[PDB]
Symmetry: C3
Subunit: 146 residues, 3 copies
């Protein structure tokens, strides 16, 4: 079994992430995650807070995951790339997910709160069984540092 | 066992993809795929049709794969990058493979039909046993939607 | 078991890579590797020699690995990206590791010898047990061509 755990850490965030235990019966590799906020991306590098904590589990243990762009992210309307190609998150990290996005255009670019620019892929490309959305207050032992 | 299935969906395509059951005894991760057509890549984003359908199989089931640049793709002659870093293709997709390629240069760039700009890597980085090239007419149950 | 083998192939290199058998008890996916030399990256593509040979082993056999940027690589001070998104190295390759890095800025950029711009991830994202740093002279059968 491979499971994902997402907890919003802001009010606007929990709007887009109502508590559920979503299953993945389509056998989709990637877990889409929302921007949760209208932002303007300037030419060059931008830091985009995702307002969530995330844990991935494989065969009972805490595991790593990768952040990868969706096809949607880069159009003729917005030349956006993930700065580090794909983000690796080690099992040890328990802070907020944050993206480095390069706007390659010479003019600024707007993204909308509902948009999913990236998806989360489990270490080793293991398809997730459930995506557990937790509510803001509930303190998982998974997000405790060590 | 991990096997790949490639079917050309155009005449010029089947030129480069004669029906075979290629084996991979070198233990190469990546399956090189040709452009099949002379194209000119303008500054900014370009959509590059690959004129093939592709299925990947691991342990009997249909599985996902990733599209990754080859070292060849980006030279001093052509600043080309894959727009989404690496393409993830879910098992469910059965249409034509298409690339988003960013020309970072300020002048247009020519690619030739014989050139392999990208390779296909099986979900979980599993080395393929055989690369089955199918012929244009043969209707695999693998490319049937569900 | 998954093990990494790094051998410096220059004197300045062995400075940063003293012979050890480092273990990875943090369960980190990525093996950080140093630039080993002050270089200036011009706008456009740059080739960055890493002055090491590397082998990866999974379950006794020689295996493949991937080169991925660290978060550190791209800042507001330096718009650097890996040109091929992530580097795949086939088990067969036994030469020096070399990076293609795109400086997206319009002015040149300095990197310092101690800096780790990239990390090595084992095929299939398998966490390494030990990182064996070998010394310059010792001829591993792993770096012999076939």
């Amino acid at each position: 079994a491979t499971n994902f755990f997402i907890q919003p850490i802001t009010e606007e965030a929990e709007a887009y992430y109502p508590p559920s235990v979503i299953t993945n019966k389509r056998k989709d590799l990637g877990v889409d995650v929302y921007c949760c906020s209208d932002l303007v991306l300037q030419p060059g590098l931008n830091i985009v807070r995702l307002h969530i904590k995330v844990a991935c589990e494989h065969m009972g243990k805490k595991c790593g995951f990768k952040i990868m762009a969706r096809s949607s992210m880069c159009t003729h309307e917005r030349l956006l790339i993930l700065a580090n190609g794909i983000g690796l998150i080690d099992p040890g990290y328990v802070g907020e997910l944050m993206l480095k996005i390069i706007n390659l255009g010479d003019t600024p670019v707007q993204i909308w709160a509902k948009e999913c620019l990236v998806q989360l892929v489990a270490q080793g490309d293991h398809v997730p069984d459930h995506i557990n959305i937790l509510k803001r207050n509930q303190i998982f032992p998974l997000f405790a540092p060590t």
